[PDB]
Amino acid sequence: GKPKVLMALYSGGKHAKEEPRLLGTVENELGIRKLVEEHGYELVTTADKDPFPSSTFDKNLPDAEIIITTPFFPAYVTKERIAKAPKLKLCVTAGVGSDHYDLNALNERGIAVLEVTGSNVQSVAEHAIMTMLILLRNYGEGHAQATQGTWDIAAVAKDEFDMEDKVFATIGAGRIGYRILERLIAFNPKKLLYYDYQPLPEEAINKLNAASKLFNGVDNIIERVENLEDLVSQADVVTLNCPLYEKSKGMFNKELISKMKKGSYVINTARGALTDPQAIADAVNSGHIAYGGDVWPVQPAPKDMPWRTMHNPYGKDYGNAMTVHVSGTSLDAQARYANGVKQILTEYFDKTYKYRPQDVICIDGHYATKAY
Numbered sequence: 001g002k003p004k005v006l007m008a009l010y011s012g013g014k015h016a017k018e019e020p021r022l023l024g025t026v027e028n029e030l031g032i033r034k035l036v037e038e039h040g041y042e043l044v045t046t047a048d049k050d051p052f053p054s055s056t057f058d059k060n061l062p063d064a065e066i067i068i069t070t071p072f073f074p075a076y077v078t079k080e081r082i083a084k085a086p087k088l089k090l091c092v093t094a095g096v097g098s099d100h101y102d103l104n105a106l107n108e109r110g111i112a113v114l115e116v117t118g119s120n121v122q123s124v125a126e127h128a129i130m131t132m133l134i135l136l137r138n139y140g141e142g143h144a145q146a147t148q149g150t151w152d153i154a155a156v157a158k159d160e161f162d163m164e165d166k167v168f169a170t171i172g173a174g175r176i177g178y179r180i181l182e183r184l185i186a187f188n189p190k191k192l193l194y195y196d197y198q199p200l201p202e203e204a205i206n207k208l209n210a211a212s213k214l215f216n217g218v219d220n221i222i223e224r225v226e227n228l229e230d231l232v233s234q235a236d237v238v239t240l241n242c243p244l245y246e247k248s249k250g251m252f253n254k255e256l257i258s259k260m261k262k263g264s265y266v267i268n269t270a271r272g273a274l275t276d277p278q279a280i281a282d283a284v285n286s287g288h289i290a291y292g293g294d295v296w297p298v299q300p301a302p303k304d305m306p307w308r309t310m311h312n313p314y315g316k317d318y319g320n321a322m323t324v325h326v327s328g329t330s331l332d333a334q335a336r337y338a339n340g341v342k343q344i345l346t347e348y349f350d351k352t353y354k355y356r357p358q359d360v361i362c363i364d365g366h367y368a369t370k371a372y
């Protein structure tokens with residue numbers, strides 16, 4: 001009877017009653033209901049996004065003009081689902097990361113795909129650093145020892161290392177990847193390596209070196225490596241900070257992992273499909289690497305997903321730092337991307353269409369950025 005805004009968020013349950021700041025939940029609807037109903041649209045919000053095609057999300061596709069998803073609990077907007085939404089015009093991401101859309105299928109229909117770029121770049125950077133510290137310093141066994149009542153110092157320390165004088169390398173030096181490099185300077189790394197299809201800005205290189213000089217009296221800390229297999233070969237820690245597209249899917253396979261040093265570390269706070277998931281679990285279970293991160297290949301992750309029971313040979317709490325996808329949905333980030341979805345909808349409803357250039361991933365049938 002009215003044009004539909006179709007929104008898929010994660011459930012809040014009792015959590016939403018104890019925290020009004022849980023804006024990114026079904027119960028609170030990002031606080032866009034007043035704006036949506038002010039423009040005569042219907043707002044439908046569900047956490048029921050799986051399975052295809054019997055979910056509430058599927059059953060509201062026919063009349064969906066706007067679809068809002070969130071990457072931490074993403075309704076996968078596939079070719080099949082696009083074909084059932086004949087009046088779809090706009091897809092908004094409550095957050096950053098639009099891998100859960102079939103962007104080429106949306107381009108063939110001339111669909112606009114909008115993110116809130118930057119709303120969690122610092123939130124993810126913190127999560128990557130946190131994961132680096134947790135793995136290198138063996139917080140897993142150190143925290144375990146405290147919880148299970150023991151005091152086996154040697155069991156913790158034997159796999160406990162300092163961040164200092166380690167080689168850190170990022171695959172991707174974008175907004176997030178560079179912010180990790182910044183937060184690594186004061187930890188005094190041996191070297192900071194990076195890999196990107198483009199150079200780091202002139203002026204970004206000097207900023208990092210300026211902090212290395214200031215904090216640690218070391219110049220030339222940042223350095224570009226051109227061969228991916230070289231970059232991982234020299235690194236103690238590698239961070240994935242690139243988006244998921246066809247050429248990057250599966251890039252972290254058995255061949256690349258095994259070209260890293262034993263006892264190295266892999267951090268992936270970007271997208272889970274950047275790895276070969278079984279190759280990661282195998283290398284963790286064999287002790288070749290430690291792995292941590294918050295992004296998974298399919299979200300929600302199956303309960304028998306190998307990453308949930310990954311652990312180095314030393315024990316269950318070694319080399320494992322998985323969390324569910326939460327880094328970009330911190331309470332502070334939720335306020336940012338809730339407001340960014342509101343800005344995007346206001347521009348669309350008022351037919352002004354003067355979206356922030358960074359927010360646009362796809363528009364008028366062309367990928368309007370190199371952010372894939």
Ligand SMILES: NC(=O)C1=CN([C@@H]2O[C@H](COP(=O)(O)OP(=O)(O)OC[C@H]3O[C@@H](n4cnc5c(N)ncnc54)[C@H](O)[C@@H]3O)[C@@H](O)[C@H]2O)C=CC1
Nearest residue numbers: 096097171172174175176196242243248269270327328371
């Ligand atoms: N875990 C979370 O909560 C979130 C995760 N992400 C994910 O991480 C990605 C990082 O994006 P941002 O840094 O925010 O934006 P961005 O605009 O800087 O995009 C990432 C950058 O990485 C580089 N890059 C792209 N493809 C690459 C490849 N195949 N290999 C190496 N480098 C490559 C490019 O410089 C690109 O601009 C997002 O696209 C998203 O998939 C980002 C936001 C939230």
